[PDB]
């Protein structure tokens, strides 16, 4: 029951959702080796709200 996004598709999705903010791949940590969007969205399905957690912060 996929809806995994992997590779180019994942990036397309990130570009589309994040727009001009940009996006990143690894959840911050500190102070379980690095995991992030591939793990949550490619190896298993994630919804739009997970995905949107990987947009860079709004600056002003």
Swiss-Prot record:
Forms a ternary complex with IGFR1 and ITGAV:ITGB3. Forms a ternary complex with IGFR1 and ITGA6:ITGB4. Interacts with SH2D3C isoform 2. Forms a ternary complex with IGFBP3 and ALS. Residues 1-29 are annotated as: B. The insulin-like growth factors, isolated from plasma, are structurally and functionally related to insulin but have a much higher growth-promoting activity. May be a physiological regulator of [1-14C]-2-deoxy-D-glucose (2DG) transport and glycogen synthesis in osteoblasts. Stimulates glucose transport in bone-derived osteoblastic (PyMS) cells and is effective at much lower concentrations than insulin, not only regarding glycogen and DNA synthesis but also with regard to enhancing glucose uptake. May play a role in synapse maturation. Belongs to the insulin family. The lineage of its organism: Eukaryota, Metazoa, Chordata, Craniata, Vertebrata. Changing residue 44 to W: Found in a patient with primordial dwarfism; uncertain significance. Residues 36-56 are annotated as: A. This is Insulin-like growth factor 1. It is found in: Secreted. Disulfide bonds join 6-42, 18-55, 41-46. Coiled coil: none annotated. The gene is IGF1. It is linked to Insulin-like growth factor I deficiency: An autosomal recessive disorder characterized by growth retardation, sensorineural deafness and intellectual disability.
